[PDB]
Design a protein around this ligand. Structure first.
Ligand code: ZN
Lengths: 48, 300, 151, 714
RNA sequence: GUAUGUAU
RNA sequence: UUUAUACUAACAC
């Protein structure tokens, strides 16, 4: 959250993140479930 | 032209807060198309950038409604409370004053006997309320307090209106807290309010109505604080209180939290209760019924 | 999601512009973003990828590098040759399991017509405004010459 | 402790000023006023806190104040005070060693109290900790930090924030710490205070500004507003649009910025005005033009001269004036400077021995120093710098100039001139004075200054620029004697108009319905009423009806004044509540002479509906009716007005008093029968003095019941 | 709806 | 009378 509260303008990827951020706040156990799954399985990640 | 005619033009603007000499200046730049932002150019134009006040009109029809028609009506049509003949609120409601009422809050819930006072009219800032309407809120405050005095508790209430541009109702919420934890709260908030917002603000963090009430107990808040812009306010007893006006609301909290995070700490709850989500809907009897029977003994 | 309609414009897009540009393409795809539009290209759509078939004898050396590196999956891909590290991870996830056991229709049609306009014309603002000046001048004469015959 | 750092901290503080400095003007200020930068935000400042030392020059602390008894000058530097430098930052920061030593002391001191609390078996109190708030490197306030239960599980944070600089490209000065675990490690509170006093107090600062030009009562309770600022603008527009708020800042410090000592520039007069721009300062040139945006300068000159003619025609008999004639005004005379022909010429019937010119407001003035038989009046409007707001010295020069000058064609060599500043809203005159004139022009100008429409327009237009809002004289004991004058007045009481009875639904959800209410307009002379009864139907099928009803009342108050003839129309309308001024001034702008007041009184217009015939008839009333009542029966035959007003005000209070058992004392009073064509009973002079105390005793009972406190001083 | 050109 | 597109836009929030 820290990153984007300061900035007056927001960008596509930021817009995208804040939704996922706000969605997590609402229901944690569902987001927890997804985090654990992301660790176990995934080994290849998007372009940084 | 003409001075007696010109006085009339000035008072009309005074009511319309959205349009003044800043909008004619900002309009002229968008309209100018060719605009280099220098000091050489801004002088070479000079007169061309200020010139306007021809298209401005409307007179009474503009002011009577205020804050646009499409925007406020859309708010009013959806507004989940507002008590009229036509519309019945979504909140269950307990006791109705002439221009106010008590009702139960959303489902997350902060405490077992957590309530909220709500004015009937679309008031926003509780400073915009009539002095006639405010007197009913005071009788509610004392009876609610005396209800929790028999329980050995005491209460802290507050209201949070960081943005009146959104044009929302203001719900002054009652939070039952024990007296030893109550005595600490003066610290907690005083830290949270000074910390929360950036500290280059003009208004100065913290404005005590607790000291002002010794000077004028009937109205310290109403005298000191200002209605027009933002703001936030807590109080202890009938007419005590700590007060902070909010700027950079994006920093503050759009969903209500700066206060709720302080109660989430002071009272100490899980981190899932911190955020308030849900709805009023209707006909939620089993929780709101236990409050009504208890409240009726102390309630006028 | 990524349906067929998407990919067949994307293939036409890259032929148009070049694989360097990506936000020009993600405009014409509407709901896709130049990261996805590019990303999904290097995984799948392009010719260089080898989608079909997996030849056993060439494949027993692909699970061999996993013994060497362990994770490190993007350095494995240019060696193994099949690329699309996703599948290079999923293929070793096949063999390690076996060893142990023993409006929407309408909106798609809109973007498919908008894309046919983009590909078709390259003239730009100056071409369109310069030809209108010819068209006005030519049309102006035809009225002006009729005035001469009238007089 | 180093020199190398402290010769950046100077040069870099200057680099930042020089940014601002440039964005107002290109020619670069020789000096600049330091209030503008260092004055706190709440007085229109940037707030920027310095290292190094800024010699505040002495000439930039003088300031003036004007009562009706004179114009007091002040000097903050003349007095024996500490050398006037802006306070340093360092002197308000506990140097580490101290902090480190105190911290372990303090946290031991906490360990003492906290363990001795558990030895007592009684929890720790706020009273003890207020001793040590802003101390400890984990400051004890961090213990009362909200997120204390959740931050307990946060860990390894200090490293995170060091690394975060690789995560995102936002250079973060507070990296070494955090505010949530270490708390505020710095407190500036007492820096702000001591800066103000170095700048000359709130007055010393405010002088530099355009606070006076707005003419608000006092700084006490004033206000600032925050604006943002859609169409596709591109680059060069969005730059100009981000620098909208910036434009105001120039306005609010214009008086100290636009002067010869700040810009050694070419002083060109701005066109169609008497002002002078010294630099170019285009952000200021625009926003002054936007204020004087019709021909406002000429109109202020004429509006003053026109409202001197209307005072001098009424009082000509006392001065023994032969003829009062206003001269023909040249179109550009208003804003010329090197020449000024007189606007009002006068004559004398007898003779008039005057006196070497003196000043108006000042107390002791001499009356025998010269001899004349004639005078004139010439008003001079003048937009002041901070370097020159003394009108006394200004006018003084103008007389001594224009009096002995041969080129100026005044009739006599004996006359008067009135100086007026619009930036500080001041006035004076160094002219030939006489017994009668001195107290006249004293009173008349002090009225004109507060009265004129031209100067009221100016003051609103400035506030439009500044966006500086706030939170006629209010009703005191002296205003009771004034309201019973020959002038007709009204007391508009829009308490009544919206009320709801209680309806219970069959289910039934609680609901409200509205009962007709009276627009109560009470006369202070005739003692009559102009009640308007409003039907439920108007209320029906409406949204936001609380605010609607307040507009609906003011519409029909103005419609009632129209129906009333020009003879019987009021002079001063008074309202109970302060909120009523906004809707009411929109309808009463067509009748501009009426002065609309706000009050501080708790006027008893709550007890009016408690009369039984008012409940019965209005409940029955099935249409809107313009009804006329009398609240004095035919008392005028026996009882006088003034006393009867204090009586019925006492009696109206008295129906909120023992609630409904003061009226129940009037019911067994049968011998005193109420008249059939009238309202009140027929109480005699003894029975008035028996009614007074009964109600006054019970009134102060309800003040004892509601407001706790019983009887206090008178 | 001008910056900038075409026609009388 | 309904639907779409552009021009009206030198509009408004
Ligand atoms: Zn509402």
């Amino acid at each position: 959250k820290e990153a984007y509260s300061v900035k007056g303008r927001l960008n596509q990827s930021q817009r995208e993140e804040l939704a996922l951020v706000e969605q997590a706040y609402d229901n944690p156990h569902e987001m927890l479930s997804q985090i654990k799954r992301r660790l176990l399985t995934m080994r290849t990640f998007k372009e940084v | 032209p003409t001075i007696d005619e010109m006085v009339q033009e000035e008072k009309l603007l005074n009511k319309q807060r959205k349009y003044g000499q800043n909008y004619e200046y900002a309009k002229q730049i968008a309209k100018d198309k060719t605009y280099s932002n220098n000091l050489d150019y801004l002088d070479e134009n000079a007169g061309k950038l200020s010139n306007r006040m021809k298209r401005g009109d409307v007179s009474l029809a503009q002011i009577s409604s205020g804050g646009d028609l499409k925007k406020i009506n859309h708010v009013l049509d959806t507004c989940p409370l507002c008590l009229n003949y036509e519309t019945q609120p979504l909140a269950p409601v307990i006791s109705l004053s002439h221009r106010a009422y008590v009702s139960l809050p959303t489902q997350p819930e902060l405490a077992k006997y957590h309530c909220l006072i709500v004015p009937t009219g679309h008031r926003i800032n509780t400073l915009s309320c009539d002095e006639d309407e405010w007197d009913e809120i005071r009788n509610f405050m004392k009876c609610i307090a005396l209800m929790f005095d028999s329980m050995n508790l005491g209460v802290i209430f507050y209201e949070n209106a960081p943005s009146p541009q959104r044009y929302m109702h203001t719900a002054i919420e009652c939070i039952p807290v024990s007296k030893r934890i109550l005595s600490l709260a003066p610290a907690y908030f005083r830290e949270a309010l000074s910390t929360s917002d950036e500290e280059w603000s003009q208004h100065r963090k913290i404005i005590d109505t607790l000291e002002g009430s010794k000077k004028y107990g009937k109205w310290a808040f109403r005298k000191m604080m200002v209605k027009e812009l933002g703001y936030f306010h807590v109080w202890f007893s009938i007419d005590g209180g700590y007060g902070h006006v909010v700027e950079d609301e994006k920093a503050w909290g759009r969903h209500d939290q700066v206060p709720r995070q302080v109660f989430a700490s002071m009272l100490n709850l899980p981190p899932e209760v911190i955020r308030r989500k849900g709805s009023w809907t209707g006909k939620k009897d089993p929780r709101e019924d236990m409050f009504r029977s208890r409240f009726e003994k102390f309630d006028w | 999601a990524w349906k067929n309609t998407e990919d067949e414009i994307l293939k036409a897009a890259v032929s148009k512009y070049g694989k360097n540009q990506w936000a020009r393409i993600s405009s014409l795809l509407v709901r896709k973003t130049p990261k996805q539009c590019k990303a999904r290209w290097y995984e799948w759509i392009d010719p260089s990828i080898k989608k079909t078939e997996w030849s056993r004898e060439e494949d027993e050396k692909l699970l061999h590098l996993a013994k060497l590196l362990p994770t490190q999956w993007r350095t494995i891909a240019p060696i193994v040759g099949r690329t699309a590290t996703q599948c290079l991870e999923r293929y070793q996830k096949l063999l390690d399991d076996l060893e142990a056991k023993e409006d929407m229709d309408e909106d798609e049609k809109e973007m498919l017509s908008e894309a046919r306009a983009r590909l078709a014309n390259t003239q730009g603002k100056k071409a369109k405004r310069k030809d209108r000046e010819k068209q006005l001048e030519l049309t102006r004469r035809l009225s002006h010459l009729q005035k001469r015959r009238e007089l | 402790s180093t020199p190398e750092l402290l010769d950046l901290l100077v040069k870099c503080e200057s680099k930042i000023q020089t940014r601002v400095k440039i964005s107002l003007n290109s020619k670069m200020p020789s000096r600049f006023p330091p209030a503008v930068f260092y004055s706190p935000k709440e007085l229109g400042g940037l707030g920027m806190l310095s290292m190094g030392h800024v010699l505040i020059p002495q000439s930039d602390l003088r300031w003036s104040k004007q009562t009706d008894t004179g114009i007091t000058h002040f000097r903050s530097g003349m007095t024996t005070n500490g050398e006037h430098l802006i306070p340093n930052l360092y002197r308000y920061i506990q140097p580490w060693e101290s902090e480190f030593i105190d911290s372990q002391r303090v946290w031991a001191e906490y360990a003492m109290k906290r363990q001795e609390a558990l030895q007592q078996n009684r929890r720790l109190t706020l009273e003890d900790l207020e001793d040590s708030w802003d101390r400890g490197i984990p400051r004890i306030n961090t213990l009362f930090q909200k997120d204390r239960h959740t931050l307990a599980y946060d860990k390894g944070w200090r490293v995170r924030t060091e690394f975060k600089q690789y995560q995102l490209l936002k250079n973060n000065p507070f990296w070494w710490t955090s505010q949530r675990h270490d708390g505020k490690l710095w407190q500036l509170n007492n820096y702000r205070v001591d800066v103000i006093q170095a700048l000359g107090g709130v007055e010393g600062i405010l002088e530099h500004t355009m606070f006076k030009a707005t003419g608000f009562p006092s700084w006490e309770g004033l206000f600032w507003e925050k604006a943002s600022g859609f169409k596709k603008l591109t680059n060069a527009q969005r730059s100009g649009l981000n620098q909208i708020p910036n434009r105001r800042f120039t306005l609010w410090w214009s008086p100290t910025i636009n002067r010869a000592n700040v810009y050694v520039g070419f002083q060109v007069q701005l066109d169609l005005t008497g002002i002078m721009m010294h630099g170019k300062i285009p952000t200021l040139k625009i926003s002054l033009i936007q204020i004087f945006r019709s021909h406002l300068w000429q109109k202020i000159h004429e509006s003053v001269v026109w409202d001197l003619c209307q005072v001098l025609d009424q009082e000509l008999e006392s001065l023994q004036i032969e003829t009062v004639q206003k001269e023909t005004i040249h179109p550009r005379k208003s804003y010329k400077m090197n020449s000024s022909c007189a606007d009002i010429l006068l004559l004398a019937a007898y003779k008039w021995n005057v006196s070497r010119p003196s000043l108006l407001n000042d107390n002791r003035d001499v009356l025998d120093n010269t001899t004349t038989n004639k005078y004139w009046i010439d008003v001079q409007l003048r937009f002041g710098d901070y370097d020159s707001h003394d009108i006394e010295r200004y006018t003084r020069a103008k007389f001594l100039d224009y009096s002995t000058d041969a080129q100026s064609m005044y009739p006599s060599p004996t006359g008067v001139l009135i100086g007026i500043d619009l930036c500080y809203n001041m006035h004076s005159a160094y002219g030939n004075w006489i017994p009668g004139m001195k107290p006249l022009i004293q009173q008349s100008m002090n009225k004109i200054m507060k009265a004129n429409p031209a100067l009221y327009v100016l003051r609103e237009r400035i506030r439009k620029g500044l966006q500086l809002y706030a939170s006629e004289q209010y009703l005191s004991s002296s205003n009771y004697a004034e309201l019973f004058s020959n002038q007709i007045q009204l007391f508009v009481d829009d308490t009544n108009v919206y009320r709801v009875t209680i309806h219970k639904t069959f289910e039934g959800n609680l609901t409200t319905k509205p009962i007709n209410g009276a627009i109560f307009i009470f006369n202070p002379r005739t003692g009559q009423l102009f009640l308007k009864v409003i039907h439920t139907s108007v209320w029906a099928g409406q949204k936001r009806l609380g605010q609607l009803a307040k507009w609906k009342t003011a519409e029909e108050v103005a419609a009632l004044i129209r129906s009333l003839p020009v003879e019987e129309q009021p002079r001063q309308i008074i309202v109970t509540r302060k909120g009523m001024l906004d809707p009411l001034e929109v309808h009463l702008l067509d009748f501009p002479n009426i002065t609309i007041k706000g009050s501080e009184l708790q006027l008893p217009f709550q007890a009016i509906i408690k009369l039984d015939k008012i409940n019965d008839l209005i409940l029955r009333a099935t249409e809107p009716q313009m009804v006329l009542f009398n609240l004095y029966d035919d008392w005028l035959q026996s009882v006088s007005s003034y006393t009867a007003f204090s009586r019925l005000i006492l009696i109206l209070r008295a129906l909120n008093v023992n609630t409904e058992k003061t009226k129940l004392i009037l019911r067994p009073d049968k011998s005193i029968i109420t008249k059939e064509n009238h309202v009140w009973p027929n109480l005699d002079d003894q029975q008035w003095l028996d009614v007074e105390p009964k109600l006054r005793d019970l009134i102060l009972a309800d003040y004892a019941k509601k407001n706790n406190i019983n009887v206090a001083s008178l």
